[PDB]
């Protein structure tokens, strides 16, 4: 066998407490080269310390093979013990029939393993639920929205940038564009939410701040004055709340802006600035020089977001930095009864800081929702002490590449089955999905304006074990490329919608609410049937839930279902290219 | 090549910060199967926002192959960036010649790869000294002695347990024997530890309770009264650190003793006690059938140490019992001035606990020595948040299995490295070696009283990068089976001694401390020179210091060395079966 290529890693992803007497065990193997897997396993102190003849490696578990990257096999067991601590070891089998033991200890033939002393073993040394990781149930029936509030609508012209421009979903907007949108115009549009079926709503940064992005906060204790107020933001929560939709904000904590009262203070004052170490300043007096680009400066004293000279870096190592963003991460939910925080930039803030927002949050509500924005594996993240999931930027990006190139379907299987393997099972059921957001290209600029392309990809991602979030306007086709492009005041035209798209966008959320999310603790499973053609299963004990993608150059003929819940070719049993057909049918 | 053997987990032991500007990297590969590595690396914001032509990843640099465990080889770099942000990949080439990219994105040819994407990359998103592990300066220097106090020396016959017996070390002590040690007998034998040598004394618990080992606690906060009182142990610690030795206490926090006021509240008061929730219950009242062994039980209604009905288990969950046992933790520090907890059972507690523990300590002195008794792997304890260390059971073990059986050198050298390869550089030099303890037999048992054996034994483990500890007695060729035989009353009759031993460890801690002690950021290095004969080189870039060890059955030739630190040969060239020899040579 592959010896290098069999690993486990104790108190992980492959070794984690799931309730108080439950444990999930993982094997990583070399991709088919170990046939079969079982795990030893007990209580470590019964070997030497119970009076009966009987010991707990004499009766193996089997593991079974669960996923594989095209590298790896992944093996996986549920392990109940009623003393909750758990010895355990693999006895794994290669292709030829060699059989090893590995443990904590390495690699041993069965007859010269000491299988007798429990230090031979891995360890679960307790059962400790306040260190296991936990999903908040709420999100597993939730399909969210993501609004840019300055291009959603405007409500209020009242309070409108100077020189805000006519709202046209046609133009192509520059970077330091007003268009008016604000929270008035959220709250004038819930019934278009409710109708579309979404119970989430995502605000990008709401907060006073110079931009019309509002990344560069100049104040997190006031909402933005061309948006709102503190009255009206609780008026927005409260109507959302009522038509069982919740809400998510942006929390901007890595950088603030440079016109925020504490960075004034240390251009004023240097380091005699109360605010100095709030900062990363390398050399005083903080400065710059300027570029042609507003967005970019070579030579800053001080560590930025990027290299731009507006968003200097905050010292979250610093306790009064701490003190001051956990106060304000806990006045949005206690105030306004926000359910959920979107955490920008979210890897480059220390793991100290994020357990304690971590506390000070469930503390507050037990199930909140904690989002980071990461574009990398985030596992050091998501032990169960800091967020709930990330911004699934690796799946999602990997749906879009294949839909949109032409890498086999094996590619793709592979891709999401190394990104499942690397977190816990109930993680990945909470990890954000997004085709597109405010920082890329929109979905059907990427597809080409190919519809059915576009709701092939939608619909594919609405399979996945991650939560789905619609991009505002996407419903209705609009179109984009990367940021600001991507940011066109929202189609409320009706001749300048596609209302096609609107009705498909109706029936996939709901069979997202209506069937996946009712499910009771699912398997999915990855077939490639054919050169680009998938077949998706997602199954409990009563019900499956089967997707067929066929994105070669040839039909494909599929068994006419007996439910179709959901298809693009008017045939029961014929798939063109691009089509796909779900269906659901008794598990027997 | 053998990808499914390559692995690279970013934000671990395999990717952390040493300095504000500094990382160290990991590579696992398969044994033999990769030939180079360079790494690709640089901030990633710099690829699209710097306008210069130059990329980082047109720079590579060269990793080492550092260690091998015989299954996998480990390659490690170490990288400056002062942005403070890291991106990177790894340039692997095989015995055949292939090269590929492998990043956190998978495998790819190097022409497929997208370098111009930092999300391609693995990622250290920003250099977080809070999140680093930090090692304390004064450990390097240390050699302890473990006391285990009812067993080292009566200074006190009036405070003597009930049928205490005569101090009498050729004794086979029963599991409940009493032979009155106590503090003021410690104190008064520091000048024989001065001597031997040692800078750290390590008590085994001294706190109330009614066992001659004190496990089984019944009140924390009182020095038990056979051992003394508290201006008795503020006179010891003033006393060992007068004389440049340090203090490190027992911390049982795992269990409680059932004489404790806690859980004797519980058997009067049932569920209605105000301590039910300090422990784990499942049944009231708590009850158990006794057997004709004292310390097992088959049936006891509530968790427990092993199965023992004596050791309730704690439940430190329960905040009342947080609070609890940081009080105790800090008051021993800040009223006594101890340097060091080393924590009983420590696997069993949760790592919530432990980080507030560190937190605690850290705060009183920022030099605090935190020590986990733990058998097994220990990775998710050493990060940097919780211990300092932990016992190096594993370590020693495989020292002592190589010593007293047969296998070959190679399997000692992969097994060290395997052990090495698991922590962080720093941490791998805060393990705490010792080869025998108050749970184990003793040395010289185990060397079946075959005095060069234990020479050679004791001197390759004190060569290893973790820190040495003599177990009471050792100095002087002390025998015993496992517990309660490894617990004999300390020798202190001259005709019992062994003084040619006792002159020996005197002149391998000076060796310790004056010499390998004092390299400055050295590297090990295992050579494996004949059948059971190894090499152990420890060099900076002054000074390297050798030791050959010949373990196997013939006569073994070195050339003269010119400065010989000791030997166990009278020749300066030939090593009989079990000699060794250690020197020091200039580097060249
Ligand atoms: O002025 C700089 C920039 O600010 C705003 O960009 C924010 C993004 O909108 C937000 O989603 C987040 O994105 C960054 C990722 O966190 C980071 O890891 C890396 O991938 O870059 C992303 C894009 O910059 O954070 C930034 C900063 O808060 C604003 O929206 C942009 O228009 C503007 O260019
Ligand atoms: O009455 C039970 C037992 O109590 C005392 O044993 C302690 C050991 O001395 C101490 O070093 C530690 O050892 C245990 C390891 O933590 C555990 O992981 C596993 O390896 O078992 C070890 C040995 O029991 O803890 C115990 C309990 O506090 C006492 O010294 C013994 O004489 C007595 O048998
Ligand atoms: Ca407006
Ligand atoms: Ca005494």
């Known amino acids: 066998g592959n010896l290098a290529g069999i690993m486990h890693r104790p108190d992980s992803e492959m070794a984690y407490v799931v309730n108080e007497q439950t444990v999930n065990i993982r094997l990583r193997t070399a991709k088919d080269d170990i046939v079969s897997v079982e795990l030893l396993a007990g209580d470590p102190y019964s070997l ?62 069965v007859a010269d393993a000491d299988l007798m002393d429990m230090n031979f073993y891995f360890r679960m040394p307790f059962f400790q639920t306040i260190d296991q990781y936990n999903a908040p149930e709420w999100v597993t029936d939730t399909v969210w929205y993501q609004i840019f509030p300055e291009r959603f609508a405007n409500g209020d012209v009242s309070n409108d940038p100077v020189g805000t421009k006519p709202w046209d979903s046609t133009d192509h907007p520059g970077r330091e564009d007003f268009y008016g949108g604000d929270l008035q115009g959220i709250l004038d549009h819930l019934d278009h939410l409710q109708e579309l079926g979404i119970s989430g709503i995502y605000l990008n940064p709401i907060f006073q701040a110079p931009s019309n992005h509002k990344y560069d906060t100049q104040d997190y204790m006031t909402v933005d004055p061309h948006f709102g107020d503190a009255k009206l933001f609780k008026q927005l929560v409260q109507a959302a709340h009522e038509r069982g939709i919740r809400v998510m904000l942006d929390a901007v904590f890595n950088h603030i802006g440079d016109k925020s009262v504490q960075w004034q203070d240390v251009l004023k004052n240097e380091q005699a600035s109360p605010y100095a170490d709030w900062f990363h300043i390398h050399q005083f007096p903080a400065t710059y020089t300027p570029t042609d680009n507003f967005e970019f400066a070579a030579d800053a004293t001080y560590d930025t977001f990027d290299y731009t000279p507006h968003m200097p870096k905050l010292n979250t190592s610093n306790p009064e930095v701490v003190d001051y963003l956990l106060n304000i991460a806990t006045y949005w939910v206690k ?40 574009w990398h594996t985030s596992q050091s993240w998501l032990v169960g002490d ?203």
């Open 48 to 109: 030497r310390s119970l009076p009966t003849d009987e010991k707990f490696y004499q009766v193996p578990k089997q593991m079974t093979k669960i996923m594989s990257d095209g590298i790896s096999d992944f093996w996986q067991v549920t392990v109940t013990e009623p003393k909750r601590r758990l010895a355990y070891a693999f006895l794994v089998t290669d292709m030829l029939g060699i059989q090893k033991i590995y443990s904590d200890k390495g690699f041993f033939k």
């Open 335 to 374: 105030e306004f009864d926000i359910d959920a925080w979107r955490l920008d930039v979210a890897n480059e803030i220390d793991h100290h800081f994020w357990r304690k927002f971590h506390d000070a949050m469930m503390a507050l509500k037990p199930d909140f929702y904690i989002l980071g924005q990461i």
């Open 386 to 588: 800091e967020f709930t999931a990330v911004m699934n930027y690796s799946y999602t990006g990997a749906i879009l590449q294949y839909f949109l190139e032409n890498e086999s379907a094996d590619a793709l299987v592979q891709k999401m089955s190394h990104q499942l393997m690397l977190y816990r099972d109930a993680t990945n059921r909470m990890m954000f999905n997004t085709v597109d957001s405010h920082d890329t290209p929109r979905l059907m600029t990427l597809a080409h304006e190919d519809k059915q392309l576009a709701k092939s990809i939608l619909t594919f991602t609405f399979m996945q074990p991650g939560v789905p979030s619609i991009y505002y306007g996407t419903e209705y086709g609009m179109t984009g490329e990367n940021d600001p492009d991507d940011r066109k005041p929202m189609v409320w035209q009706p001749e300048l919608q596609d209302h096609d798209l609107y009705d498909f966008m109706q029936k996939l959320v709901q069979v997202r609410r209506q069937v996946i999310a009712k499910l009771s603790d699912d398997k999915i499973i990855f077939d490639v049937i054919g050169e680009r053609q998938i077949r998706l299963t997602r199954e409990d004990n009563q019900t499956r839930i089967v997707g067929v993608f066929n994105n070669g150059t040839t039909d494909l003929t599929v068994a006419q279902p007996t439910s179709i819940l959901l298809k693009t070719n008017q045939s029961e049993t014929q798939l063109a290219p691009n089509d796909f057909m779900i269906w659901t049918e008794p598990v027997r």
